[PDB]
Amino acid sequence: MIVIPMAGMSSRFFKAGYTQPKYMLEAHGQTLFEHSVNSFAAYFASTPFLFIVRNVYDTAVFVREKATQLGIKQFYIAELHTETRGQAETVTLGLEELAKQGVDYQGSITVFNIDTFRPNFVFPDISQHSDGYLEVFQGGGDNWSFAKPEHAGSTKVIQTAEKNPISDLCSTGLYHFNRKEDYLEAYREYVARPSQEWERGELYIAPLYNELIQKGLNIHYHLIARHEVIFCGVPDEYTDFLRQ
Numbered sequence: 004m005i006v007i008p009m010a011g012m013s014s015r016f017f018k019a020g021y022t023q024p025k026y027m028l029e030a031h032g033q034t035l036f037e038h039s040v041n042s043f044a045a046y047f048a049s050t051p052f053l054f055i056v057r058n059v060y061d062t063a064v065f066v067r068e069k070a071t072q073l074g075i076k077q078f079y080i081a082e083l084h085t086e087t088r089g090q091a092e093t094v095t096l097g098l099e100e101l102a103k104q105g106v107d108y109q110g111s112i113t114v115f116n117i118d119t120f121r122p123n124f125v126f127p128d129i130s131q132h133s134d135g136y137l138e139v140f141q142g143g144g145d146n147w148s149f150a151k152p153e154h155a156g157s158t159k160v161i162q163t164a165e166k167n168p169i170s171d172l173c174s175t176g177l178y179h180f181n182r183k184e185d186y187l188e189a190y191r192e193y194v195a196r197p198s199q200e201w202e203r204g205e206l207y208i209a210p211l212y213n214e215l216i217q218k219g220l221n222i223h224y225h226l227i228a229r230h231e232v233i234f235c236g237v238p239d240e241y242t243d244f245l246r247q
């Protein structure tokens with residue numbers, strides 16, 4: 004199941020002068036929402052999608068209309084009524100809402116964000132031989148979530164960090180978990196950490212893998228090329244995408 008947490012707020016875009024939430028902005032004939040979800044076009048007929056939105060800007064209606072139009076055959080919308088502390092909480096609340104709708108899903112979940120485009124995405128082979136994996140690229144700077152490799156020739160991940168550059172393998176924002184239950188258990192452990200371990204209040208997805216790795220689960224990374232991912236999460240990137 005492809006899960007897209009999109010309950011956040013477009014604050015940088017608001018300041019930049021846009022009055023619509025970022026995912027409704029248009030570029031080259033379609034909304035950023037469409038550009039991002041189309042990454043998974045190969046799975047529209049076979050895989051369920053869970054869109055987790057907020058009760059603002061009539062987003063639930065927008066998503067339902069766009070998803071139907073894209074031809075996504077099975078999708079669910081979880082509408083949240085309060086802001087969350089971050090994507091990890093959004094995902095957890097969305098999965099809880101899905102269950103409240105009567106849907107009993109126990110399979111894998113692939114978390115992705117609406118700020119990223121991954122044209123022609125196809126699941127890598129490692130997704131069939133691991134408990135979870137983080138898609139990564141060779142990135143510049145320190146403002147990414149990082150995955151630390153065990154050693155050359157192995158795609159095993161021994162640690163992840165959201166702001167600490169423990170490696171040069173940066174997350175593309177695609178986080179896969181073979182079992183929904185493992186995601187929820189890692190989340191539960193993460194929010195229950197003794198207070199001394201908290202460095203911030205935001206709840207991001209990447210750190211959750213440390214809970215799984217500690218429990219001995221088999222977590223890997225999958226390296227993609229820089230040209231296979233397009234980021235459109237800040238105003239300047241949207242402007243750049245508009246020129247492309």
Ligand SMILES: [Mg+2]
Pocket residue numbers: 196
């Ligand atoms: Mg712990």
